């Protein structure tokens, strides 16, 4: 614009928002305060399992779960696999992600690390799904 | 040995009374790697005829390029529409720091070491126009001496 104008009101940079906000909130549980500490992957507990319908083009039944994390946020998370052992009450370990079909879902469940069982009957790209090597 | 290389092969189409007429358009850059380079864009129902016509146009329109020590003499900005391409001289050894249409133009022209940056749009025809404008607007250090009555680029 003008040197004087920028001297008076400098350039303000646009803010940046995260894609997985619920993974960066930590609850102290003694003082009951929530602080912004970044964490890659976080443990939660599921409340309701079921299926959703993909948005416009896709047509299927995709497995979701309403999981409440170690903090006080409840998120809808897609279970990445064919078949699951979720029983409406279990402990899962969510990581970042974004399924395009289901709106509102912005997290995935790591398979075969904790209570949730791994994905057997898989020999290709198994290291992502948590499957023991056939050997 | 006028080498040629294909820069873009688009699939353009028009609509008629029922159906679509589809034609391939090719953007070819022809250069002898010694100072002569041209560009040609052509459209045809098939790729071979499109390439033939594009090569014919490129050979019909050839421009003369002058090099200094294998590079460009002075920093320049070529403008063509919304595409602005910045060229900057480089010392011998850096090689071609160009990518895409600019890289094709520079290699086929014959330059060895050039710094380049596409500051605007990324449409190959307009980038090529900007690059050609930048190289054509260049001033040799003998034309300026003739103009200003200096002594053949002496201090």
């Amino acid at each position: 614009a003008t040197i004087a104008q920028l001297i008076r009101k400098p350039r303000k940079k646009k803010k940046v928002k995260s894609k997985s906000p619920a993974l960066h909130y930590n609850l102290n549980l003694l003082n009951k305060k929530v602080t912004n500490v970044y964490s890659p992957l976080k443990r939660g507990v599921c409340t309701r399992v079921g299926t959703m319908t993909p948005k416009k083009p896709n047509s299927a039944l995709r497995k979701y779960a309403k999981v409440r994390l170690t903090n006080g946020f409840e998120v809808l998370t897609y279970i990445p696999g064919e078949g699951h052992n979720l029983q409406e009450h279990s402990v899962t370990l969510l990581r970042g992600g974004r399924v395009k079909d289901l709106p509102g879902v912005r997290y995935h469940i790591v398979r075969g690390t904790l209570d949730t069982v791994g994905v057997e009957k898989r020999r290709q790209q198994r290291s992502a799904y948590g499957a023991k090597k056939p050997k | 040995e006028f080498e040629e290389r294909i820069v873009k092969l688009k699939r353009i189409s028009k609509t008629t009374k029922g159906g679509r007429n589809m034609r391939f358009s090719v953007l070819v850059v022809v250069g002898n790697r010694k100072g002569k380079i041209g560009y040609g864009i052509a459209k045809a129902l098939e790729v071979p005829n499109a390439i033939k016509k594009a090569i014919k146009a490129a050979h019909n329109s050839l421009h003369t390029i002058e090099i200094h020590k294998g590079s460009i003499y002075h920093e320049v900005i070529g403008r063509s529409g919304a595409s602005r391409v910045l060229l900057k001289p480089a010392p011998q050894g850096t090689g071609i720091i160009a990518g895409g249409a600019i890289r094709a133009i520079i290699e086929l022209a014959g330059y060895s070491d050039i710094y380049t940056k596409n500051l605007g749009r990324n449409t190959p025809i307009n980038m090529i126009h900007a690059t050609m404008d930048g190289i054509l607007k260049q001033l040799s250090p003998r034309r300026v001496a003739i103009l200003r009555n200096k002594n053949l680029n002496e201090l």
Binding site: - | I6, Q92, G95, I97
Partner: protein
């Protein structure tokens, strides 16, 4: 640590170890890209990235080099004075096991590397075990003595077929090297300088 299908890799890239021993073979004289999908169309018009990657792979497989080592050597050479197209070639060719090959005391480059790792090779005034030491022309790289009596020493001492840039003083196996290899001694397997530009982009 190296591949065990040098035939497959030579058939893919098209360039062998400058002798065509892995191309002539004893069967079928195959000079096609491996796999079932070898005799198909779409041969030329390799992208710039594709041809740069192919040339880089040929270069860093001709000597048995890990890409990380390649980045390390390039970062080493890049800062000095200026256009080092005459220096980085010496840098790439100065490998110890490579010098053993051009000395002629091993049938193959990786066999020479195995001997170097096993410790049948000496140096100017010390001993060397790692097959990556950067050498400089002038060091008396004298071969071991207890390795001259091993059941496989014949082709080793048959070094009369030697490169002119490694001088042995034949029958003495002194094996020094002066008059650094030229682009003539670095054949057309990889003779290009925009792999330098590719590593300039991908390595600061």
């Amino acid at each position: 640590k190296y591949t065990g299908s040098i035939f497959k890799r030579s058939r893919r890239l098209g360039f062998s170890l400058l002798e065509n021993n892995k191309e002539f073979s004893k069967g079928k004289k195959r000079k096609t890209i491996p796999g079932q999908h070898g005799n198909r169309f779409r041969s030329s018009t390799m992208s710039g990235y594709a041809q740069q990657l192919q040339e880089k792979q040929r270069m860093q497989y001709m000597y048995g080099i890990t890409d990380k080592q390649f980045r390390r050597l390039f970062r080493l050479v890049l800062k000095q004075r200026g256009n080092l197209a005459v220096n980085l070639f010496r840098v790439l060719e100065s490998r110890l096991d490579n010098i053993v090959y051009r000395m002629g005391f091993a049938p193959t480059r990786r066999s020479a590397r195995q001997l170097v790792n096993h410790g049948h090779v000496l140096l100017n005034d010390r001993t060397v075990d790692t097959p990556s030491i950067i050498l400089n022309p002038g060091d008396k790289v004298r071969l071991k003595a207890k390795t001259i009596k091993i059941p496989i020493v014949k082709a080793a001492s048959e070094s009369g077929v030697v490169s002119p840039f490694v001088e042995t003083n034949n029958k003495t196996f002194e094996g020094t090297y002066v008059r650094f290899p030229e682009r003539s001694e670095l054949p057309a397997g990889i003779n290009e300088s925009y792999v330098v530009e590719w590593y300039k982009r991908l390595v600061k």
